[PDB]
Write a structure and sequence with these properties.
It is classed as protein binding. Keywords: Translesion synthesis DNA polymerase, Y-family DNA polymerase, Ubiquitin binding motif, Ubiquitin, Isopeptide bond, Nucleus, Phosphoprotein, protein binding. The assembly is dimeric. The complex is a heterodimer of chains A (76) and B (32). Chain A is α+β, with helices and mostly antiparallel strands and 76 residues long. Helices cover 14% and strands 34% of the residues of chain A. Chain A has a five-stranded mixed sheet, covered by helices on one side. In chain A, a hairpin with a 3-residue loop joins strand 1 and strand 2. Chain A is globular, with a radius of gyration of 11 Å. By secondary structure, chain B is an all-alpha fold. Chain B has one domain. The chains are: A alpha+beta (76), B mainly alpha (32). Chains A and B meet through strand 4 and strand 5 of A and helix 1 and helix 2 of B.
């Protein structure tokens, strides 16, 4: 499937994943598309924030669905 | 203040939840 990660600049990067794909691996595809390391990058969906150990399905996201990408400076 | 790197723009940053914006602007300002 595919999902549309809107970046914070007003961009939308579509990426191809599974509902069972984890947020960590989604952010790693953002690193492929945008260049941002996952530990430094955050993910929102529908005015809520996601965690690396969760999945699109955990947030009930499906195909052709939109996400939000922020920069969060650091993590470790 | 509604951006820091070129990766940020007020429109999406307003669609954004306030508490995550709070993290962002405060940290952006701090590392700034």
């Amino acid at each position: 499937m595919q999902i549309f990660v809107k970046t914070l600049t007003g961009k939308t990067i579509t990426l191809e994943v599974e509902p069972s794909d984890t947020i960590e691996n989604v952010k790693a595809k953002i690193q492929d598309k945008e260049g941002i390391p996952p530990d430094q990058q955050r993910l929102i969906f529908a005015g809520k924030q996601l965690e690396d150990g969760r999945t699109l399905s955990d947030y009930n996201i499906q195909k052709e669905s939109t996400l939000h990408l922020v920069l969060r400076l650091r993590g470790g | 203040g509604h951006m820091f790197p070129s990766d940020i723009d007020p429109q999406v940053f307003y669609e954004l939840p306030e508490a995550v914006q709070k993290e962002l602007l405060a940290e952006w300002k701090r590392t700034g």
